Design a protein around this ligand. Structure first.
Ligand SMILES: *c1c(F)c(=O)[nH]c(=O)n1[C@@H]1O[C@H](COP(=O)(O)O)[C@@H](O)[C@H]1O
Ligand SMILES: *c1c(F)c(=O)[nH]c(=O)n1[C@@H]1O[C@H](COP(=O)(O)O)[C@@H](O)[C@H]1O
Lengths: 213, 213
């Protein structure tokens, strides 16, 4: 695959239909707050049972250590395989997530630099240090921006070749599968697939581009 | 009051009992992901209907603009009066939240500097600029740390006297109601109340200290 579906539809019926339509082209579904806050955490269990795919909970966890632990424990209890957590709040907040993931046999992904224009204001300047903090904490899974492949390159340099790196911002945000997969292990794609007239054809089209690399 | 309850219990029965016990000492309940991810967004509507108090959704929103809008729209649809959003992701992410709050007749609180030790690593260095970004965006409600009253002072200086400023980190995290209320309009208190043998007595004790100021 190398393709992770960002399932940000907000209606259970549509989320299930689109995921079902594209599942032959992905092995991982990324579920975030647009779907969870609309349909409840039980949606994570349903997706697991219906589809079998890995579930990453994209909750961009960004609270104090005590609250981060509670968020992680609720999320894994609901059946998520991994959770995405922000590095910007610092090492104690990240460690809290890693401690729960250890307890529960799950994975943490560290979000380093974000893909949107606003990320340039504060996040970008800290992002190398956030990545290096990850390495120092023993984080093995990272998120970095498809929209800035030169920053992906730098992040890959920091985390090394033996870390797993996934990357949002492909399609709608302007990122390209090829420029991104030079550095990331897998791309995250939401709207380019789930808003397409034929999501299966969109996913298939992306997979064809990936195979050509 | 000047007291906001951080309701981070993870069981509907306990959350309702403790809130009911202390409601005569607060007019605002802050509900976050520990309770919502455990009991569902319907908990917000229940609290509103049972208690009448203002509800602030402490979701520390930290995504891209398009996703931030979806998160805000789901949260207000569930009945929250206000949402807490991170400033660190930048102005476009914040504006997205403000646009939804405008559409829906609700409020955004901008989180500037966080209260925990890790906030020193990256957030603190950006926090003055995040506050000034808030002012430039017309944000009128802010969150800053009880644990660092000198930073609260600086944040108050930036936002001015006509902005509303609320402050977590009182009690469990080491913050003091008095040192904090020199600068903040209201303090947020969670564990010092909700883990107390008698939460009503804990809240009452805090209110007594506040009245003495
Ligand atoms: C999260 C994040 F931290 C980013 O830096 N960028 C980003 O886009 N996200 C989330 O990833 C998905 C992108 O979907 P698409 O732009 O393909 O529709 C979304 O879930 C977004 O929240
Ligand atoms: C959020 C935040 F952004 C902070 O800087 N600090 C902080 O503590 N929070 C949240 O506020 C409440 C504090 O509760 P207490 O320490 O009194 O138990 C919690 O909801 C925490 O997530």
């Amino acid at each position: 695959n190398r393709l992770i579906l960002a399932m940000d539809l907000m209606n259970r019926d549509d989320a299930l239909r689109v995921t079902g339509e594209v599942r032959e082209y992905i092995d991982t579904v990324k579920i975030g707050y647009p779907l969870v806050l609309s349909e409840g955490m039980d949606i994570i269990a349903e997706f697991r049972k219906r589809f079998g795919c890995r579930i990453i909970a994209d909750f961009k966890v960004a609270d104090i250590p005590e609250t981060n632990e509670k968020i992680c424990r609720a999320t894994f209890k609901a059946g998520a395989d991994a959770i995405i957590v922000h590095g910007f709040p610092g090492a104690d907040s990240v460690r809290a997530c890693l401690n729960v993931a250890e307890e529960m046999g799950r994975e943490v992904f560290l979000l380093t630099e974000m893909s949107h224009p606003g990320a340039e204001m504060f996040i970008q300047g800290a992002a190398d240090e956030i990545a290096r903090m990850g390495v120092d904490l023993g984080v093995k899974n990272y998120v970095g921006p498809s929209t800035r492949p030169e920053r992906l390159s730098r992040l890959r340099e920091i985390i090394g070749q033996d870390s797993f790196l996934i990357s949002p911002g492909v399609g709608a945000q302007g990122g390209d599968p090829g420029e991104t997969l030079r550095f990331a292990d897998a791309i995250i794609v939401g709207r380019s697939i789930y808003l397409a007239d034929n999501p299966a054809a969109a996913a298939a089209g992306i997979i064809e581009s990936i195979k050509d690399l």
